[PDB]
């Protein structure tokens, strides 16, 4: 049988089928031409002919149907900016008239657009200001006049809020029936700019300098304000009043972040604020006052969330999930033993009640009805790298049902879920350890309705390939279980010695040992090159409690590095590893850890590859870096900021073969970071291999560059292993 070759990986010879649906109601979903499916019976009818927009004249990047099904928003001229942000053009098509709307069009270069949650109002951001359309074909109402490129952002995030706080460009939040539009405003006036060249097509005679407001660690941060406007009022001198809700006094005393916005009712919004020292967070719960038209946050309804051992949240304070009446909410919180569990709050009582407990964690709350809360956790079989859907009875917390554990326990140990609008149906998505499996279920009695996609065609194809296998297991260190996985070559033989590649990420709350089925570079390395590809979750890794997660607090570049080295020693002791052929590689945080390990002097590793590494924490952005590292000042944590750089280890790279790779247009981990590694290596006379990727960003993900980088790394590894 053939093996899984590099060309198979790079050409996507063997494709995972998906089943990506969009719920439009409690019982229908859209699926791609466009069909609408009835969840209960599985029958479909054609929702939008794949010929409808043949003559449209543009390629349509995406669509979005209004909640009342009356209009479809068509996105085209898509132009990517950062991880989530982009600009696009939009047309609106009227589904009753079968007419495109040609009047009062959304402008070109629109930065964000969203329907109201009911009806068909639109809110959009253009040139950094917010506009509202009550009707798709009528004029917009301007909401803000302060928008200013790179300086004032209304309703959209700046770079660091996009990447590290909201994971979204959008900073607009409609109230549930669409009366109110809440939004944040960011002021980057004094935030320094990262500047880097962009070369563009070769016809561009002068390179272009990209300038992005980007606060590196300890620098001046954007400031933020929060506003709510009543869009039903757009009957006042066209000038609706934006009512500010100010941060609490405990936040205003210093630098802070707005880190969560969640509406609770039509007239009640909750906001969470986080101090720049991210171990103290405050939730305000604010009610509309009909008589004054203002928003009041009763101090009795304020909730404090703080951490004595670390930062707050996995990456930020968790979202609340409110009961329908808005008088109570559920929220994932670290319990007294350090494990993240669901706590039940009354809005005006400070003590919450944990409704789950144990030596495992809740991953997320997925749906809440009058009777049940549904959540994903890694409880099943005590496997932190597995994921299952559970439902807990709100009137009796001792009644907890695992909805997914036993559906196919051999094939399916990693689930996510997508519920319909009022949770009357749910799609389960199993992603491993076998082939992904998508199924539909009815919540009324948790019956499997039908298999949506089982990947049987890919199964048949893979049967003719010498696929690697995957072992997921643990080693005990200091009476603590630490999980690892190995991608093992086909016909793996414990009596033989294999080269081993340690595939590292190891950032705070990371998890590289899990039950997910992947087809990736490691699949090729194991299948064709007979390399064991191993990953290990040491101190700092996620989903196993705060004692493990917070072990690297204020100390990035220490234990999570040491534990990758120890893991390699442990794997060598297993007897199937050629200890003369151990390599290490990783991307981003993984390139940082790879580099730290290669500079450690441990002698364990022959060679390694760092792709877009962090090299010095003062080069990375404030929100992420300070969360773990505090401030780079003599009074706080400067000594460890300066002790944890790659460059200070340059001399030790004389012991190893290193390949350093970075895209020149990386807005996230700046090319600067690898520019300083290479300069430090040159300064101590260390030879190494290098590759820049012109105009590639942090993902080095254009089609050609993706192929080029994995080809180049494959050559390096094979050379290192005398393959």
């Amino acid at each position: 049988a053939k093996t899984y070759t590099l060309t198979d990986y790079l050409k996507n010879t063997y494709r995972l089928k998906l089943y990506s649906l969009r719920w439009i109601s409690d019982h229908e979903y859209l699926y791609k031409n466009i069909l609408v499916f009835n969840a209960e019976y599985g029958n479909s009818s054609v929702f939008l002919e794949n010929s409808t927009f043949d003559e449209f004249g543009h390629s349509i990047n995406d669509y979005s149907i209004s909640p009342d099904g009356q209009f479809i928003l068509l996105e085209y001229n898509y132009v990517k900016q950062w991880r989530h942000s982009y600009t696009a053009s939009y047309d609106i098509y009227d589904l009753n008239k079968r007419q495109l709307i040609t009047e009062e069009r959304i402008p070109n270069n629109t930065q964000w657009v969203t329907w109201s949650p009911v009806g068909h109002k639109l809110a959009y951001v253009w040139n950094n200001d917010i506009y509202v359309k009550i009707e798709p074909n009528l004029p917009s109402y301007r909401i803000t006049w302060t928008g200013k490129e790179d300086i004032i952002y209304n309703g959209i995030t700046d770079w660091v809020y996009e990447e590290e706080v909201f994971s979204a460009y959008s900073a607009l939040w409609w109230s549930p029936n669409g009366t109110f539009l809440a939004y944040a405003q960011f002021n980057d006036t004094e935030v320094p700019l990262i500047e880097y060249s962009f070369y563009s097509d070769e016809s561009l005679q002068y390179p272009k300098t990209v300038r992005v407001p980007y606060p590196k660690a300890g620098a001046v941060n954007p400031t933020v304000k929060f506003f709510v406007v009543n869009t039903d009022s757009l009957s006042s001198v066209t000038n609706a009043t934006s009512i500010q809700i100010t941060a609490p006094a405990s936040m205003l005393i210093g630098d802070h972040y707005l880190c969560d916005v969640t509406w609770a009712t039509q007239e009640r919004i909750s906001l969470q604020w986080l101090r720049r020292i991210q171990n103290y967070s405050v939730m305000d719960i604010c009610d509309y006052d009909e008589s004054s038209g203002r928003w009041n946050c009763l101090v009795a309804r304020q909730h404090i969330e703080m951490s004595t051992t670390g930062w707050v949240g996995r990456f930020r304070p968790s979202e609340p999930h409110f009961t329908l009446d808005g008088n109570s909410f559920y929220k994932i919180i670290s319990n007294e033993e350090g494990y993240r569990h669901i706590c039940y709050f009354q809005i005006d009582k400070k003590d919450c009640t944990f409704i789950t407990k144990g030596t495992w964690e809740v991953i997320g709350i997925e749906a809440l009805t009058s009777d049940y809360l549904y959540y994903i956790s890694n409880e099943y079989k005590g496997m932190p790298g597995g994921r299952n859907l559970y439902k807990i009875q709100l009137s009796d917390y001792t009644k907890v049902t695992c909805l997914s554990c036993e559906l196919n326990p051999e094939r399916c140990q990693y689930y996510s879920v997508s519920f319909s609008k009022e949770a009357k149906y749910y799609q389960l998505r199993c992603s491993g350890p076998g082939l992904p499996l998508y199924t539909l279920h009815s919540s009324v009695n948790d019956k499997g309705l039908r298999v949506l996609e089982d990947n049987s065609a890919l199964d048949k194809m893979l049967q003719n390939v010498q696929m690697p296998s995957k072992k997921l297991d643990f080693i005990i260190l200091n009476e603590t279980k630490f999980w690892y996985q190995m991608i093992l070559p086909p016909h793996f033989d414990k009596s033989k010695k294999y080269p081993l590649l340690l595939d590292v990420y190891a950032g705070p709350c990371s998890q590289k040992a899990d039950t997910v089925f992947r087809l990736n570079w490691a699949t090729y390395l194991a299948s064709t090159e007979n390399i064991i590809v191993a990953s290990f979750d040491g101190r700092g890794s996620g989903y196993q409690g705060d004692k493990i997660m917070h072990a690297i607090n204020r100390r990035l570049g220490t234990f999570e590095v040491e534990d990758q080295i120890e893991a390699a020693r442990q794997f060598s002791k297993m007897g199937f590893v050629d200890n003369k052929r151990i390599a290490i590689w990783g991307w981003s945080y993984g390139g940082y850890v790879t580099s730290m390990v290669l500079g450690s002097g441990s002698g364990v590793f022959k060679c390694g590859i760092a792709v877009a590494p962090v090299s010095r924490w003062e080069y990375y952005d404030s929100v992420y870096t300070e969360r773990y590292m505090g401030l780079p000042t003599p009074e706080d944590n400067l000594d460890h900021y300066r002790n944890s750089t790659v460059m200070s280890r340059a001399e030790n790279f004389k012991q190893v073969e290193y390949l350093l790779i970075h895209g020149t247009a990386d807005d996230n981990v700046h090319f600067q970071q690898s520019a300083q590694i290479s300069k430090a290596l040159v300064d101590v006379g260390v030879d190494f291999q290098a590759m820049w990727y012109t105009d590639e960003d942090h993902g080095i993900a254009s089609s050609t560059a993706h192929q080029h980088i994995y080809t180049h790394m494959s050559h390096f590894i094979k050379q290192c292993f005398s393959l």
Partner: peptide
Amino acid sequence: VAMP
């Protein structure tokens, strides 16, 4: 997030 330092991740691709």
